[PDB]
Structures are given as structure tokens and as C-alpha cells.
């Protein structure tokens, strides 16, 4: 559900050291990554209504986590959505 | 159980007819009765065991 290899690489890319796994910035990027992947899954199929529930969930989460960060460090926030590429 | 190729261990989990045997007979655990079925089914598909005494 998103390779150890890749998942690790992003923790490596968004938090302090690896191990800083649960950093706000990092979860958002970890989710982002899966979400974007998933698009191709639901492209084909589209009827996979159950799996879709998990994906929406995915987004409910990120959205919530992204709002929290904003309230904290709107710098870490702005940096983040530029970096991932969302909000338009 | 461990494997479908084990037509040996397998053949004492079916009747003359070929029908899988309930767990209430074999005393088999739960988890394994499934492993057992899923491997008898495999055996059946690879003509390694009849579905039917009709053959």
C-alpha cells in the first residue's frame, strides 16, 4: 500500500532525520503520495466504491492535518503545499 | 493442509464420493479446515483429485 522503499524516502524528504516519521509535514506528504498514486487505480475500475471510501478518508485526514499545521506554523504550511503541489 | 500436492495426507479428508468432510467429523481445527478445503479445491482443479466418484 505504498512501498517501504518509497514511504521511507518521503519521511527522509519531509521530516528531520528518518524516525521523525510522525511529523505533521511528513504525514501530509505520505498521504499525498498515496492519494496521487490511487488516482490511476480508480481511473480504471471506478466502480471500486469501497476502496474509494479509504481514499476519501485519506483526504479527510490530510485536510485535517493540513489545517492544524496552518494554525501552528503557517510557514511550515505554505512551504508544504508548494512542495507537494496542492491548493492551486 | 500444508499443501495440495500432498494428495497423500489429503485423501483422508474426503469421502468415497470425493466430498470434503465436515470438521465435526475430522476434529480438525478451524483455521486449518479452510487451508484444507482451499487445498482440496486446488487438488481438484489440477486433476489431482476427483470432484466426483463419477470418475
Amino acid at each position: 500500500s505504498l512501498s517501504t522503499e518509497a514511504t521511507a524516502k518521503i519521511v527522509s524528504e519531509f521530516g528531520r532525520d528518518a524516525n521523525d516519521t510522525g511529523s505533521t509535514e511528513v504525514q501530509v506528504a505520505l498521504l499525498t503520495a498515496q492519494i496521487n498514486h490511487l488516482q490511476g487505480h480508480f481511473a480504471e475500475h471506478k466502480k471500486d466504491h469501497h476502496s474509494r471510501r479509504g481514499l476519501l478518508r485519506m483526504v479527510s485526514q490530510r485536510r485535517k492535518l493540513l489545517d492544524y499545521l496552518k494554525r501552528k506554523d503557517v510557514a511550515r504550511y505554505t512551504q508544504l503545499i508548494e512542495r507537494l503541489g496542492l491548493r492551486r | 493442509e500444508i499443501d495440495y500436492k500432498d494428495i497423500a495426507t489429503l485423501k483422508n479428508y474426503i469421502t468415497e464420493s470425493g466430498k470434503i468432510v465436515p470438521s465435526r467429523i475430522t476434529g480438525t481445527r478451524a483455521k486449518y479446515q479452510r487451508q484444507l478445503a482451499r487445498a482440496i479445491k486446488r487438488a481438484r482443479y489440477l486433476s489431482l483429485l476427483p470432484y466426483t466418484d463419477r470418475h
Binding site: - | 500436492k5 486446488r42 482443479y45 489440477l46 486433476s47 483429485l49 476427483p50 470432484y51 466426483t52 463419477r54
Partner: protein, 100 residues
């Protein structure tokens, strides 16, 4: 890289092609740097029921580690090929050896 059990059954008459097939499927798999953890040319075995008419048939067990891609083309060539009367690529969960 995923493992699979994999076993097919070749039509008796076309028995003599079984070698060339194994040779081939192997060069195919190894070709993409995939290991070949077990191989067993069970030969002509007798069938539980008759299938496609005709009884007995040439078996081939063969465990492998290879990308979900060569596994694909394998499954189809088993269709493209009329000599193989059944196949079945299976589970995974790490390699295996000897059994039977």
C-alpha cells in the same frame, strides 16, 4: 520480487515439447534477473478424472521468483498454447524446495 508456485500440464502427444518449454520459460524468467527456486518434470501422470477427453498428462511443478510482468506473459502463452491443457500460477510467500 514475488514468488509463485506455478504448475502446468502438457498434452501427451506434445510431450516432447515439454523440455523446450521449460528451457524457454526459464530463459524468460532468469532473463529479467529472476531466480528459479524449484523445478520438477513430473512427466506423464494419470488423471483423477478425464479432461479434454484423454487420460494421463505431462506435469511440471516449478517455483520461481520474478516480476509481476513476466508472470503475466506466462499466463497468456499458456493460453496461446493449445498443448497445455491446464496451468495455475499460485500463492508466493517466499521460495520453496524439494517437497512433492
Amino acid at each position: 520480487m514475488r514468488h509463485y508456485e506455478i504448475v502446468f500440464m502438457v498434452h501427451p502427444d506434445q510431450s516432447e515439447q515439454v523440455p523446450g518449454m521449460i528451457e524457454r520459460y526459464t530463459a524468460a524468467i532468469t532473463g529479467a534477473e529472476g531466480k528459479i527456486h524449484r523445478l520438477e518434470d513430473w512427466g506423464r501422470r494419470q488423471l483423477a478424472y478425464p479432461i479434454n477427453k484423454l487420460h494421463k498428462a505431462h506435469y511440471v511443478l516449478m517455483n520461481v521468483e520474478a516480476p509481476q510482468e513476466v508472470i503475466d506473459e506466462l499466463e497468456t502463452t499458456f493460453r496461446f498454447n493449445d498443448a497445455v491443457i491446464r496451468s495455475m500460477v499460485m500463492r508466493t510467500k517466499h521460495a520453496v524446495t524439494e517437497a512433492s
